[PDB]
Amino acid sequence: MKLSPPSKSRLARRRAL
Amino acid sequence: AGPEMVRGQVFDVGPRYTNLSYIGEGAYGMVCSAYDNVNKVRVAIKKISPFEHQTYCQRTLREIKILLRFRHENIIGINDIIRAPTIEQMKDVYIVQDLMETDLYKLLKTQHLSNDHICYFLYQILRGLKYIHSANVLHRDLKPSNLLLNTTCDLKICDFGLARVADPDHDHTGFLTEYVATRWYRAPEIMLNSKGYTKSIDIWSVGCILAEMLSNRPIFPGKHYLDQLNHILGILGSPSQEDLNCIINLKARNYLLSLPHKNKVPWNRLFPNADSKALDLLDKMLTFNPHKRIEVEQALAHPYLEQYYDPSDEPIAEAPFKFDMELDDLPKEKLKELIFEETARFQPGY
Ligand SMILES: Nc1ncnc2c1ncn2[C@@H]1O[C@H](COP(=O)(O)OP(=O)(O)NP(=O)(O)O)[C@@H](O)[C@H]1O
């Protein structure tokens, strides 16, 4: 499996706001 | 034509679920993916066949009751359960869940994780554990194979068959000698003691998982509990007498105390390429003395996890989890009844 960057994950995206 | 068989055994889950494909097996369950003809998506289905063994019945009941009650982004849910229409006919149970793409055990075989991935996976593990612990439940069996993962980096904890309500006076021998696939993530006190377990046993396991994400090797492997304890002592150094006073059996304690002295190995010597903040947190999770381990809330507030820290979005349970009665001393026949009752709500036309 090729992981996407964590920043693309929904929970991570909530934290980035 | 007919009920589909996978790797030799029937998965009697049609007509709703069809086109089965093997994913893998644990020590108790065989897991396949399946197409759900109602919702038009592929799902995961775990078949267990527990009813001839009291302990397997316990696992099945605990996992079903707990996962049906819990609701959290980083914990696998149960969406459906299939079993026979009568208790007499019921030999198998099929637990239907969201299909995750892999687990951490499988992924660590194939690749070394970046620090960014380690950090976010660790955050999710602890966020899910916060919810579990808030319900006064110990998972008791955290390990890479029960951390489910997707390509989006979403992580969900699964495999709650050994989960118990925290009770430091509860004395359940059985756990020490019952078969499991791996003991390498177990806290030292639970390799030796049959009671007094606390939430800190899960923090130990998470520490072991963190170490293994850093290096792609298990930190404390071993052939059995004595070998494993030697691995622990060889890294953490010799426990103090007060550290070892948590061990109940005096001859076990005296055995440990009599072993050759070991110095602590500094974490940055074992993991020279690891983030120093990660190692600081690791150090605070992997302490021999259970009372001295960081607990989940303070761990979430550790600097390693700062980019993900937000106490406004780390949900807790509405109430402690409760079993109606102590399962330990119930006959397998009574446990079967309780499993039948808990699964009734999913029967067609209920
Ligand atoms: N919802 C799921 N989606 C994808 N894979 C899953 C899912 N549930 C389980 N698995 C996989 O199936 C394996 C076994 O599931 P698990 O619930 O741990 O089974 P078990 O036999 O009851 N307990 P154990 O021996 O501790 O693994 C896991 O390690 C995963 O690889």
Contacts of A1 in chain B (CB under 8 A): 101-102, 107, 110, 149, 151
**Mutant choice from B110, B116, B120, B300 vs A, greatest count of A C-beta within 10 A:** B120
Among B259, B264, B269, which residue's Cα sits nearest to residue B237? B264
Are B55 and B21 in contact by the 8 Å Cβ rule? The answer is: no
B46: Cβ–Cβ under 8 A, 6 or more apart, which residues? B29, B30, B31, B94, B95, B97
Are B117 and B156 in contact by the 8 Å Cβ rule? The answer is: no
Are B194 and B173 in contact by the 8 Å Cβ rule? The answer is: yes
3-state secondary structure of B140: coil
B305: Cβ–Cβ under 8 A, 6 or more apart, which residues? B119, B122, B123, B126, B281, B299
Q: Which residue reads 């003691």 in tokens?
A: B193
Q: Which two tokens stand for residue B69?
A: 């009650």
List all residues of chain B from 108 to 127 with a beta carbon under 8 Å from chain A. 110, 116-117, 119-120, 124
H helix runs in B160-199, sequence order: 188-192
Q: Which two tokens stand for residue B282?
A: 């690791």
B18: Cβ–Cβ under 8 A, 6 or more apart, which residues? B4, B34, B35, B37
Mutate to test the pocket of ligand 1, among B20, B46, B142 (most ligand atoms within 8 A of CB): B46
Determine whether B335 is exposed, middle or buried from the number of CB atoms within 10 Å of its CB (0-12, 13-18, 19+): buried
φ/ψ of B75, rounded to 5, equals -130, 130
Determine whether B214 is exposed, middle or buried from the number of CB atoms within 10 Å of its CB (0-12, 13-18, 19+): buried
Contacts of B154 in chain A (CB under 8 A): 9-11
Contact A4 B152 (CB under 8 A): yes
Can you tell me the distance from the alpha carbon of A13 to that of A4, in angstroms, rounded to the nearest whole number? 13
- In units of Å, what resolution does this entry have? 1.5
B220: Cβ–Cβ under 8 A, 6 or more apart, which residues? B184, B208, B228, B231, B232, B235
* Elucidation method: X-ray
B178: Cβ–Cβ under 8 A, 6 or more apart, which residues? B55
- DSSP annotation of B250 reads H
Can you tell me the distance from the alpha carbon of A16 to that of B307, in angstroms, rounded to the nearest whole number? 8
CA angle centred on B261, ends B256 and B264, rounded to 5°: 105
How many Cα atoms sit within 13 Å of B250 on the Cβ side?
0
Q: Which two tokens stand for residue B240?
A: 């103090």
A13: Cβ–Cβ under 8 A, 6 or more apart, which residues? A7
Enumerate domains of chain B plus CATH numbers. 1-99+329-350 (3.30.200.20), 100-328 (1.10.510.10)
How many Cα atoms sit within 13 Å of B24 on the Cβ side?
12
